[PDB]
Design a protein around this nucleic acid. Sequence first.
DNA 1: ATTTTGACGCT
DNA 2: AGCGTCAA
Length: 430
Amino acid sequence: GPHMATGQDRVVALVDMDCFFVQVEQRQNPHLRNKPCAVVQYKSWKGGGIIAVSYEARAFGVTRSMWADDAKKLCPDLLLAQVRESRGKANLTKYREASVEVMEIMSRFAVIERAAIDEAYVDLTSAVQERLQKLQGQPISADLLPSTYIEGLPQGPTVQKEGMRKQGLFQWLDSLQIDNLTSPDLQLTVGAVIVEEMRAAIERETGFQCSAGISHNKVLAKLACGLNKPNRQTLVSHGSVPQLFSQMPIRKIRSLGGKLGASVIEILGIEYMGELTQFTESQLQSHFGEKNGSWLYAMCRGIEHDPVKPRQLPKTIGCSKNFPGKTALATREQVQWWLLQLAQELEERLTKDRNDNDRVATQLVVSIRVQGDKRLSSLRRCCALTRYDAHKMSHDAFTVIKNCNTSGIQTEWSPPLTMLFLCATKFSAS
DNA sequence: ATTTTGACGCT
DNA sequence: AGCGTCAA
Ligand SMILES: Nc1ncnc2c1ncn2[C@H]1C[C@H](O)[C@@H](COP(=O)(O)OP(=O)(O)OP(=O)(O)O)O1
Ligand SMILES: [Ca+2]
Ligand SMILES: [Mg+2]
């Protein structure tokens, strides 16, 4: 009752760019705008692997992970843009730079946590308080929320999409108490007004559209964001949680899409997030551990305390290349040449990072996979990163992996290498 | 033969 | 530290 926390103490948003790499390529090449199109890396093997797909192309069934040759079978007029290739490998620089454009705009509104190349969480609690003080008891107009959905509404006693959206928004705004500056629902609504402004700024200043979720924590904001993609935002209130979770597959909640989620389903014999409420906290801890159990117990009630971390920049800078099938590296010269290629890209990115962000990486992580090994990585070894020099970094990586070559003949490498990975970590201010 | 990334947890 | 999980 009066002491049961309800996890309504924050306003958190999650902004996720729509079909991001596709929009970057469509901004650059207007011929691709409003077309079924996809972004592909490489081309020789089955037309290249698709990594991003416009919504027009998704209507034909085109998906990520599909080979372009296969996507063309579903969508013969599919347009394709290829990822840049530099030093023999795919180079994602254009998308990292576009990401910086968006992150820098979002940071004008609030502290952000960069969650991925095209997603950031926003802690809007303070901005909401300020905006509520400015508003001075003034009601919030539907015109301030032109792309907002209120999850769960309309309800109770038009057949078009926008009509339903407006009916739900009208019900929501009709039922708010605007004089109570401590109302969580009012706080979320002001949050959504701010997110409309943030999304408009992103689109105005970059050309890119995005979706967003607004709720009281990161997990619900993320879930909310996906409910009405693309180019829309969704408010998930605390009160919407029981109905929303009553038919929500467990795997849809962030962190439960893999083995742990499968084990929750198997061990407990349930399917939906809401079914978790019938277990005690101790029961969940007994099956899934102290941390996961407490997290599950609160999360299924819509409560999560994970903070929006103040971090706009990635914590690592990495370069990776697979060598599948017959391309596996089988000679010392091959391994050294590709380590150099990776190291040269890493050097270029690190030097730019040091100039832009006043920091230096101090550790180099080298990871490889050997042909035959079932694990993704066969070996992961660190060494010191003391100079931004590609030849030195490639030599040091070779030094830390050379003992993996079983072959008695020095010129041959066995078992052949199917993956090389260099990652700069442990940044210090400079 | 999706590939190329990142973050964080465990021991 | 090195390995594993989960997510763009
Ligand atoms: N598995 C992957 N491998 C390589 N790149 C990926 C992968 N998944 C996503 N990306 C890249 C391309 C995407 O445009 C970008 C953002 O990913 P993601 O948010 O999951 O999808 P998306 O932005 O393309 O579409 P949308 O968010 O509208 O559903 O990251
Ligand atoms: Ca996205
Ligand atoms: Mg994303």
